[PDB]
Design a protein around this motif. Sequence first.
Motif, short mmCIF file in Angstrom:
data_model
loop_
_atom_site.label_atom_id
_atom_site.label_comp_id
_atom_site.label_asym_id
_atom_site.label_seq_id
_atom_site.Cartn_x
_atom_site.Cartn_y
_atom_site.Cartn_z
N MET A 129 0.86 -1.18 0.00
CA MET A 129 0.00 0.00 0.00
C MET A 129 0.89 1.23 0.00
O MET A 129 1.78 1.35 0.86
CB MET A 129 -0.90 -0.01 1.25
CG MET A 129 -1.72 -1.28 1.45
SD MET A 129 -2.70 -1.14 2.95
CE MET A 129 -3.52 -2.73 2.99
N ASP A 130 0.63 2.15 -0.93
CA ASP A 130 1.47 3.36 -1.11
C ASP A 130 0.93 4.68 -0.55
O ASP A 130 1.49 5.76 -0.84
CB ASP A 130 1.84 3.53 -2.59
CG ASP A 130 0.69 4.02 -3.45
OD1 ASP A 130 -0.44 4.17 -2.93
OD2 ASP A 130 0.95 4.24 -4.67
N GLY A 131 -0.14 4.62 0.24
CA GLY A 131 -0.67 5.80 0.85
C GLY A 131 -1.42 6.72 -0.10
O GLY A 131 -1.88 7.77 0.31
N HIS A 132 -1.52 6.33 -1.37
CA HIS A 132 -2.26 7.11 -2.34
C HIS A 132 -3.42 6.30 -2.89
O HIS A 132 -4.57 6.72 -2.85
CB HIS A 132 -1.33 7.56 -3.49
CG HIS A 132 -0.27 8.53 -3.06
ND1 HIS A 132 -0.30 9.86 -3.42
CD2 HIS A 132 0.81 8.37 -2.28
CE1 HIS A 132 0.75 10.47 -2.90
NE2 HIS A 132 1.46 9.58 -2.22
N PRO A 184 -5.58 4.74 1.68
CA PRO A 184 -4.99 5.75 2.54
C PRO A 184 -3.84 5.30 3.43
O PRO A 184 -3.22 6.13 4.04
CB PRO A 184 -6.17 6.21 3.39
CG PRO A 184 -7.06 5.04 3.46
CD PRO A 184 -6.90 4.29 2.16
N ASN A 185 -3.53 4.01 3.50
CA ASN A 185 -2.42 3.63 4.34
C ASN A 185 -1.19 3.22 3.56
O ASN A 185 -1.23 3.05 2.35
CB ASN A 185 -2.78 2.50 5.30
CG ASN A 185 -1.69 2.25 6.35
OD1 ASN A 185 -1.25 3.18 7.07
ND2 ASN A 185 -1.22 1.01 6.42
N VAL A 211 -1.39 0.15 -5.14
CA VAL A 211 -0.56 1.33 -5.42
C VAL A 211 -1.09 2.02 -6.65
O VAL A 211 -1.80 1.42 -7.45
CB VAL A 211 0.89 0.92 -5.66
CG1 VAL A 211 1.39 0.04 -4.52
CG2 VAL A 211 1.04 0.16 -6.98
N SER A 212 -0.71 3.28 -6.81
CA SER A 212 -1.13 4.08 -7.93
C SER A 212 -0.51 3.75 -9.29
O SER A 212 -1.18 3.85 -10.30
CB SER A 212 -0.76 5.55 -7.66
OG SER A 212 -1.29 6.02 -6.45
#
Lengths: 225, 227
Positions: A38-41, A44-45, A71-72
């Motif tokens: 998970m990349d925070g984008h 949300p984490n 991830v994005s």
Amino acid sequence: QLKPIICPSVLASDLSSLASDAKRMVDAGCDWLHLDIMDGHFVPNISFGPGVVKALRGHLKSAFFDVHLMVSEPEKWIQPFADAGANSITFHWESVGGDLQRAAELAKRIQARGIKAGLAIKPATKFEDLGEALAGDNFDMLLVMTVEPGFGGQKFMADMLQKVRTARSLFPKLNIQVDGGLDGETVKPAASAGANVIVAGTSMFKAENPAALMTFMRDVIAASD
Amino acid sequence: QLKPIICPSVLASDLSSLASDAKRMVDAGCDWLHLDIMDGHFVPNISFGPGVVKALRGHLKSAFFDVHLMVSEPEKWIQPFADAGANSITFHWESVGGDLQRAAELAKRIQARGIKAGLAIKPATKFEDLGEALAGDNFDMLLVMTVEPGFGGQKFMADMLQKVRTARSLFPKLNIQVDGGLDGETVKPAASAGANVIVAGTSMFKAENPAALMTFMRDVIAASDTL
Ligand SMILES: [Cl-]
Ligand SMILES: [Cl-]
Ligand SMILES: [Cl-]
Ligand SMILES: [Zn+2]
Ligand SMILES: [Zn+2]
């Protein structure tokens, strides 16, 4: 034919002692280790990256690593996760803009490395939106999220099983994974709908005997097929 | 008074046995544990997030956690890392649009949480930009990157020490941290330039005796007349 495959999600373990927890799951007879990136984008984490995966590979040399890219820009992570030891890499349809050519191409890039390619869909994404993405062995697996991605401990969304049913009808030989709220109870309707690959997080790390629970899950899948 | 502060960077440890490796560093007498948070957008790598830090905190109750946010939107990560147990949070000038008012507000917010606030700059960013920001007394530390951020094991960029020198002249009492390629050799020019806070990754985790390396580094800082 379809094999029952159970994949404990390490994100649910003690994040500061991943190797020890992963080894427990391996010793309890898991098939795969599901690694949520998970990349925070995209969600949300932020979970962990290639370094963690690579370090795990060092301790668990034969384990099957199932990398789930929340991830994005999944294209940027293929080489780092391949070098870290991934055996399967799943990316999201929504991460590649629902672009069929971008998706088909990324899958082949992953497969060129001898890695299985999976395609994931979020709850709000309708199965029909895939069009022919799953046609002609583009992908080795479909991941139908059964909870909104990015968080563990959420409640299984049974209505998402219709996507599994439809997918199973069209692709009898395709691995179909479900992820989110899977436990000894929800594995039944999931298997019944056609899912043969189960990601289990909280239920698996809380289990009294994880081995028995994974055996039960396989038994349920084998009985549906 | 300025103290020598050595902070092993856990990004260079066995990430699959973080508690165990961080404990080694704590037992070796580290001052802080440096935790690089990378979101794969601000820098081309993803390290780990609040969950990992929180798990580490559970094992190391008294350690000082120095969180370095190499993320696109640091504003969104302040509370998660405060909850995870951060004792200091450093964010990048480039993450807040190189904007003076944004940087100041974010620092005040970190400080209201009873957490030290740090401001970081990438190699390509000229130190002049940060002038007023650091004078505002909103920041407890300046972090000068001595490699292009994202990965450990890169070559120390000595030319970056000019920023440290300039900063040290202007703010004699400000903690100044350097990060990237610090080892037994590079710590000397870094400390002469005025850095009193040292982040060491690869060198520290490869050291046969990290306790002695950390002590050597404090000796170098103390002798540099930085203090
Ligand atoms: Cl974004
Ligand atoms: Cl590639
Ligand atoms: Cl000492
Ligand atoms: Zn997943
Ligand atoms: Zn750092």
